[PDB]
Amino acid sequence: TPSMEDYIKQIYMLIEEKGYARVSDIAEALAVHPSSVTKMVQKLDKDEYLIYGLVLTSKGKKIGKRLVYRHELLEQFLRIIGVDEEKIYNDVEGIEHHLSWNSIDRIGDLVQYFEEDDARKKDLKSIQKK
Amino acid sequence: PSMEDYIKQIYMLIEEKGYARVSDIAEALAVHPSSVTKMVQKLDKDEYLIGLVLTSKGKKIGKRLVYRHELLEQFLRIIGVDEEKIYNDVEGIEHHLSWNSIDRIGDLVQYFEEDDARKKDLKSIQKK
Numbered sequence: 001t002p003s004m005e006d007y008i009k010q011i012y013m014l015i016e017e018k019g020y021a022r023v024s025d026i027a028e029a030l031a032v033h034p035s036s037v038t039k040m041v042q043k044l045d046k047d048e049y050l051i052y053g054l055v056l057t058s059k060g061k062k063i064g065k066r067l068v069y070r071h072e073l074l075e076q077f078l079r080i081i082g083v084d085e086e087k088i089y090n091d092v093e094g095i096e097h098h099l100s101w102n103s104i105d106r107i108g109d110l111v112q113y114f115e116e117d118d119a120r121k122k123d124l125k126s127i128q129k130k
Numbered sequence: 131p132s133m134e135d136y137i138k139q140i141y142m143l144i145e146e147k148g149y150a151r152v153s154d155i156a157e158a159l160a161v162h163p164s165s166v167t168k169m170v171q172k173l174d175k176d177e178y179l180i181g182l183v184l185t186s187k188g189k190k191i192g193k194r195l196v197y198r199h200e201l202l203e204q205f206l207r208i209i210g211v212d213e214e215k216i217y218n219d220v221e222g223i224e225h226h227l228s229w230n231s232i233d234r235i236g237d238l239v240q241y242f243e244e245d246d247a248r249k250k251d252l253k254s255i256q257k258k
Contacts, residue, residue: 087230
């Protein structure tokens with residue numbers, strides 16, 4: 001579920017940054033009540049994404065890494081096509097949960113398409129002026 | 131999001147049939163008629179509509195939502211998404227893109243439509 005994804009991603013990021021993931025830190029990151037975190041952590045434990053501080057299983061590690069990649073890729077996509085930086089995080093936080101892997105792969109190809117030659121970015125800019 | 135899907139469907143039904151029955155909305159969204167009635171009251175109260183007729187505010191929004199939906203399908207289509215995946219993705223992402231992102235996506239679509247070479251170059255990337 002979208003929510004589950006947000007928690008897995010935040011948990012992965014906390015562990016990578018701090019070394020560990022406190023319920024309290026997840027609550028702050030997501031702007032939710034700790035009860036909401038505790039409930040989700042239970043579903044995550046049950047579904048074998050983590051154990052119990054919280055330690056991701058190999059499945060939870062793989063999934064979290066892909067979720068962070070997806071986020072970064074999506075920000076990079078919106079940045080390249082020239083969306084105002086302030087708007088990017090909010091849009092990615094929403095759209096990330098509704099793109100198939102197929103779309104994400106194709107978006108990956110599109111980002112590499114532009115990154116591989118700045119001249120295509122300049123042409124995109126030229127279109128934006130028109 | 132919820133309201134957006136309702137206004138979009140209501141608009142399309144009116145353009146398509148000439149009117150929007152609660153039962154047709156219920157079927158289009160896979161919700162129960164009791165939910166449609168509740169929503170319709172909100173849209174009446176929020177002044178998107180007035181059987182039921184969209185106000186100028188409702189018709190302008192419905193048209194924009196339709197444009198955004200079609201634009202997003204055309205975008206995913208252009209960048210090579212399997213046709214069968216496209217609708218479900220558009221129905222989800224459409225609600226969480228700012229106008230800024232939609233306009234840039236539109237520029238991006240025009241970018242590819244201007245030169246078939248650019249599409250050829252993207253297909254080459256995909257193979258690589």
